[PDB]
Design a protein around this nucleic acid. Structure first.
Ligand SMILES: *O[C@H]1[C@H](O)[C@@H](N)[C@@H](O[C@H]2[C@H](O[C@@H]3O[C@H](CO)[C@@H](O[C@H]4O[C@@H](CN)[C@@H](O)[C@H](O)[C@H]4N)[C@H]3O)[C@@H](O)[C@H](N)C[C@@H]2N)O[C@@H]1CO
Ligand SMILES: [Mg+2]
Ligand SMILES: [Mg+2]
Ligand SMILES: [Mg+2]
Ligand SMILES: [Mg+2]
Lengths: 103, 88, 211, 84, 122, 129, 220, 72
RNA sequence: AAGUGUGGAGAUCGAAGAUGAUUAGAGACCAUUGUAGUCCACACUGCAAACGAUGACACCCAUGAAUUGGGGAUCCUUACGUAUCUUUCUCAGCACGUUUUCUGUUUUCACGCGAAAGCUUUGAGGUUACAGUCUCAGGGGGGAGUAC
RNA sequence: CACCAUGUUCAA
């Protein structure tokens, strides 16, 4: 039973032979780069309660000059993406939905 | 004179069935998408007569989407529907 | 189908008829395009909308009227619309021509479930849209009912026999195709005469938001 | 619409789009043209897809430049396509 | 004091159909009608029917209720709606000009009727 | 590569006829594949066809009239004696009433029914019904 | 009595549609089993049960059990029909398959092997029919062969009016649910094959619901 | 993807079949001589022997008995 | 990839091994290490879920988004529609837009097929209506990819 | 993300 056409990974049949693996973001498991689920997070450094304390005590930072943030590009193992609930198991008809941009 | 005979010339089979006017496909008894469409023959004053032109289409041809192309091709051949504008 | 057996020009589009079609914008298609309605397009305008050939619009309009006028017991024609903009026009076409009509949710089993008490068996189905009336068409596929449709530029034409090309989207554009078809079926029957204009206003075919 | 495709006698719109070998009878895309030299003025016959660099036999100059498809004639030269 | 059963709701719509004119926005008067128009044995249901009837009388002051089948406010407003002006909306559309597009006007030269009168090119 | 041009032609006719087409374009053609089609014209399974001249092998445009169910090619072209016609009819034809087996004989390319009457044998080319 | 609901059964009860081949001509669904025993004579219509086997559904606390019954019907003159219904009691599913087998009635074209001399003894061409993996192939046989078939296709081919036939079966024929419905699909294809008898053009007719539309409106 | 035509391809088809008949456990037992040389009867039936000792062979699951049999 | 031979290299990870811990036991997972290896040169091996669990070469095959490289335009109809912005030098340039067409990797979508899951111009379709060419393997589960 | 191993033979 082929659970999914493309077999879990972005490689088609006659395109690549292999893709060199990356380590998982927390597991450290080596999975191929096209297989491993990849999220680019734009996480702020401070919570909006905590950022308001720091922006008030800052000569630089205010409503005019915004505070920096973290830009890190996480890539996870498939065991690692389910367990951190980055990704979840979806119904059989619902598995083909593909999101091309961050919602 | 249609259907098989006996060598005594009596029409042996029951039920000579219809044929599709587009694809010459013999319409079966369970082909429940097969439709007949009667088009009114109309006179010189634009009022219908008592005669109609009937054309029957098989069920798979409607199933694909190709029936509407077939009704055009028939009614141009029968002379029912004009193929283009006249010259201005 | 504006070709009669004798060869007269009685059914052909006139400069009064085509002037109504241009005013009601029932020749403007949508931006998208399907394969089966690709033959009905004249060209694409700027802002990417499709223009429908008014010859092929009028020839498929009269062809659908030569089928409806060749129905004794006109209640065997059922005309139906799941979209809301059609429902007022479906009522007035059914009033002047004398056909069955249905609007709203189609309630599946209307054509197949024979022990229902809302069980009808029409001979010709007229749908306003092939897409929103997918359920009316798909039951016609089961019980031998040919389908007349007001198709837009992207229409799924599985099981549609006489596909009329028009603009079935807008409120004025719809209902103008039902006025003009009701105006025509009454002419082919001989109820109204082709010389004088049909006095009955188009405005009653338009859907009006009663709140 | 309303005209069906005839495979023996295809439409000019259908047939002009086709690849040169996918035509009903295959044929060239290229042609010859009568190129006048920018100086020197003498006419030369230059093939439209000339991968070699043709020279003016009088001028001694090169009035063509090969490309991936049609070859590019020099600036300031006049040319009209020859028939057949 | 929770969701009304479909026994309460189907019966309450039938009271509004057959007896719309005898009912208003009060509980304690609508209850006295429903004891004379419903032959059931329970006083608990007849309290719940007079509660949901009173609710769908406040809904009929606002607008239409689905499944109400009142057939006189629907027969009145079907007559008030089927009214048209003397000049059609198509006859007022030609009388200013139809103003077709580039591609449309380039099509209308090709027809056997030519370009119709009262037209423009925009 | 293309091995049998007749087997190519009959496969494109049979494929386009189960799709219900009005015309096929057959490429390449031969003297054999036009002599097969003229057997299929004489018993009216196809209509008029037209051979376009390249200075290559030609192309054939065949007008279909809905009557052909299946035409195919028997490969290799097995030798068929006169005693062997009733064996080939039971194998590839649906009935003894209709349907033809085309053979290439010394007398020409004929169907099985004509070759039985002229008392000849040949190599079998194909069938149509 | 039997009050009909469909327009076809109104015309059958009124004797406006007189024979069963007038329904087969216009591809009409029957939808009411009283149409068939009205049009076919009552003594000239045979039926008997092909198979009854139980099918179980695992539930919480045990198995659910319903019996799936197969019935075949047809006079032995070119009409055949097979229906398969299910039911909790074995008596209900046998009765429901009788209702079902008449709705699926369908005609069988019959023909000749060699020369034509009387009523047709065989099917007019080689035909196969496939349901599941079980495909049976029915081949015309000579005049005095008999039905050469397994006893489940042989009983179906007797009711269809076929007197002499060769038969093959390609795979898992011990499944009789698909073996029965593959003999039915093969005999149903006998009016699907276009032979040079039927090449001729026939003049079109009018639907019984087209012609008798004025009578059917008088039932309302 | 299975087999070969060709009017002159019979040696290929004869070789192809003679090797694939060895996979048939009925053809291979009827055409090898380990079949009779290891059969305790000499490729025959009803061989005589001398009773040595009596054995009770217990039945397989789900049955339960001991089967009375001799070793000869 | 692991492995082997001879020379280099030896940062990091690290079969073996050593210590912690968890455990009823822990020869494991987890933590700290650490040898061979990892990396290069020249030889050897030829053992993969070496996969699309799909042999190669042709043929026919409906539809709508896209994408990569190249090229070209701006009673069955005798022909036709062009925008954007960067521009002192690998610059008569670059990218785009609308449209053609060839080659490649694909996607949601008509037949048909299949026991089904599913496949579908990229066939698993064109197959009991069974023959385009060639080729390799299989014949109930084991023993056994064992013994010689 | 502490630890969490197992339940005799046929049969219903
Ligand atoms: O070789 C092509 C073939 O001739 C043609 N049938 C075409 O089919 C389509 C066409 O599909 C492609 O759409 C792509 C754009 O999204 C386009 O690719 C092209 O992009 C242009 C811009 N970069 C070109 O410059 C480029 O060279 C070219 N590859 C088309 O190929 C559609 O656009 C049509 N609407 C419909 C045609 N049937 O596709 C073949 C290659 O895929
Ligand atoms: Mg790999
Ligand atoms: Mg631990
Ligand atoms: Mg370490
Ligand atoms: Mg133990």
């Amino acid at each position: 039973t082929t659970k999914r056409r493309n077999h879990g990974r972005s490689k088609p049949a006659h395109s690549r032979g292999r893709v060199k693996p990356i380590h998982c973001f927390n597991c450290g498991r080596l999975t191929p780069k096209d297989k491993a689920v990849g999220r680019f997070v734009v996480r702020r450094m401070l919570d909006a309660a905590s950022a308001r304390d720091v922006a008030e005590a800052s000569p630089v930072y205010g409503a005019n000059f915004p505070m920096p943030k973290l830009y890190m590009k996480q890539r996870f193992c498939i065991a690692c993406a389910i367990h951190s609930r980055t990704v979840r198991a979806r119904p059989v008809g619902n598995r083909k939905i593909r999101y091309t941009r961050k919602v | 004179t249609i259907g098989m005979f006996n060598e005594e010339g009596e029409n042996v089979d029951l039920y000579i069935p219809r044929k599709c006017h587009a694809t010459n496909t013999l319409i079966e008894a369970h082909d429940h998408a097969a439709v007949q469409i009667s088009i009114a023959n109309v006179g010189p004053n634009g009022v219908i007569n008592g005669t109609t032109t009937t054309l029957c289409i098989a069920g798979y041809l409607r199933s694909q989407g190709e029936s509407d192309h077939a009704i055009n091709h028939i009614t141009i051949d029968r002379g029912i529907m004009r193929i283009k504008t006249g010259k201005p | 189908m504006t070709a009669v057996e004798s060869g007269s020009k009685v059914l052909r589009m006139k400069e009064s008829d085509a002037q109504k079609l241009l005013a009601m914008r029932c020749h403007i298609g949508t931006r998208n395009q399907s394969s089966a309605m690709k033959k009905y397009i004249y060209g694409r305008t700027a802002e990417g909308s499709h223009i429908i050939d008014l010859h092929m619009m009028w020839e498929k309009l009269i062809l659908a009227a030569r089928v409806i006028a060749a129905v004794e017991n006109p209640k065997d024609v059922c005309v139906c619309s799941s979209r809301l903009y059609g429902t007022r026009a479906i009522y007035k076409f059914s009033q002047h021509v004398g056909t069955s009509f249905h609007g709203g949710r189609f309630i599946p089993g209307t054509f197949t479930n024979q022990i229902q008490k809302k069980f009808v068996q029409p001979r010709v189905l007229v749908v306003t849209d092939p897409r929103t009336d997918h359920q009316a068409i798909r039951e016609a596929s089961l019980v031998n009912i040919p389908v007349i449709a007001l198709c837009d530029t992207d229409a799924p034409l599985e099981y549609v026999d006489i596909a009329i090309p028009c603009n079935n989207r807008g409120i004025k554009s719809i209902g103008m195709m039902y006025w003009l078809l009701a105006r025509e079926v009454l002419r082919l029957r001989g109820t109204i005469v082709r010389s004088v204009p049909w006095e009955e206003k188009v405005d009653l075919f338009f859907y009006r938001d009663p709140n | 619409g309303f005209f069906d495709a005839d495979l023996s006698y295809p439409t000019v719109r259908t047939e002009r789009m086709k690849h040169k070998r996918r035509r009903l009878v295959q044929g060239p895309n290229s042609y010859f043209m009568d190129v006048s030299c920018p100086r020197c003025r003498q006419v030369t016959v230059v093939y439209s897809h000339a991968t070699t660099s043709v020279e003016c036999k009088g001028c001694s100059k090169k009035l063509c430049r090969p490309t991936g498809g049609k070859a590019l004639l020099v600036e300031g030269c006049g040319y009209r396509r020859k028939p057949d | 004091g929770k969701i009304r059963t479909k026994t309460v709701k189907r019966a309450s719509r039938q009271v509004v159909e057959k007896y719309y004119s005898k009912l208003n926005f009060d509980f304690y008067q609508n209850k006295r009608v429903i004891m004379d128009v419903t032959i059931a044995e329970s006083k608990k249901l007849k309290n719940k029917i007079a509660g949901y009837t009173t609710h769908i009388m406040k809904r009929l002051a606002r607008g239409p209720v689905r499944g109400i089948s009142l057939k006189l406010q629907e027969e009145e407003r079907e007559r008030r709606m089927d009214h048209a002006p003397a000049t059609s909306d198509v006859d007022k559309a030609i009388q200013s000009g139809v103003s077709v597009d580039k591609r449309t006007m380039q099509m209308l030269q090709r027809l056997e009727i030519g370009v119709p009168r009262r037209v423009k090119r925009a | 590569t293309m091995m049998s041009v007749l087997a190519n032609a009959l496969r494109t006719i049979a494929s386009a006829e189960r799709r219900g087409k009005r015309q096929v374009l057959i490429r390449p053609s031969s003297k054999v594949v036009v002599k097969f089609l003229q057997v299929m014209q004489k018993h009216g399974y196809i209509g008029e066809f037209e051979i376009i001249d390249d200075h290559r092998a030609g192309k054939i445009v065949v007008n279909l009239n809905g009557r052909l169910n299946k035409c195919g090619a028997i490969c290799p072209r097995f030798d068929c004696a006169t005693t062997d016609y009733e064996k080939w009819m039971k194998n590839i034809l649906p009935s003894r009433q209709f349907g033809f087996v085309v053979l290439t004989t010394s007398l020409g390319i004929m169907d099985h029914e004509e070759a039985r009457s002229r008392n000849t044998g040949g190599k079998v080319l194909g069938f149509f019904y | 009595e039997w009050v009909p609901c469909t327009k076809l059964g109104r015309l059958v009860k009124a004797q406006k549609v007189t024979s069963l081949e007038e329904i087969f001509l216009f591809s009409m669904p029957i939808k009411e089993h009283q149409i068939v025993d009205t049009l076919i004579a009552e003594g000239q219509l045979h039926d008997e049960m092909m198979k009854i086997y139980p099918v179980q559904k695992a539930t919480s606390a045990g198995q659910r059990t319903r019996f799936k019954a197969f019935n075949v019907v047809g006079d032995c003159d070119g009409h055949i029909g097979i229906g398969a219904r299910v039911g909790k009691e074995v008596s209900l599913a046998i009765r429901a398959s009788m209702i079902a087998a008449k709705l699926n009635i369908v005609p069988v074209r019959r023909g000749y092997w060699g020369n034509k001399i009387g009523e047709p003894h065989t099917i007019p061409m080689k035909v196969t029919g496939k349901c599941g993996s079980v495909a049976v192939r029915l081949v015309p046989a000579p005049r005095g062969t008999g039905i050469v078939a397994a006893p489940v296709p042989k009983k179906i081919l007797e009711f269809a009016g076929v007197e002499d036939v060769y038969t093959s079966s390609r795979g898992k024929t011990r499944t009789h649910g698909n073996l029965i419905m593959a003999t039915f699909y093969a005999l149903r294809k006998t009016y699907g094959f276009l032979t040079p008898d039927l090449w001729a053009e026939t003049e079109p007719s009018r639907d019984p619901t087209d012609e008798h539309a004025e009578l059917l409106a008088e039932m309302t | 993807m299975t087999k070969t035509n060709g009017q002159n391809a019979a040696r290929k088809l004869v070789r192809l079949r003679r090797r694939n008949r060895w996979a048939d456990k009925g053809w291979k037992r009827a055409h090898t001589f380990a079949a009779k040389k290891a059969n305790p009867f000499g490729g025959s039936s009803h061989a005589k022997g001398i009773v040595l000792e009596k054995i009770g062979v217990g039945a397989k699951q789900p049955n339960s008995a001991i089967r009375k049999c001799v070793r000869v």
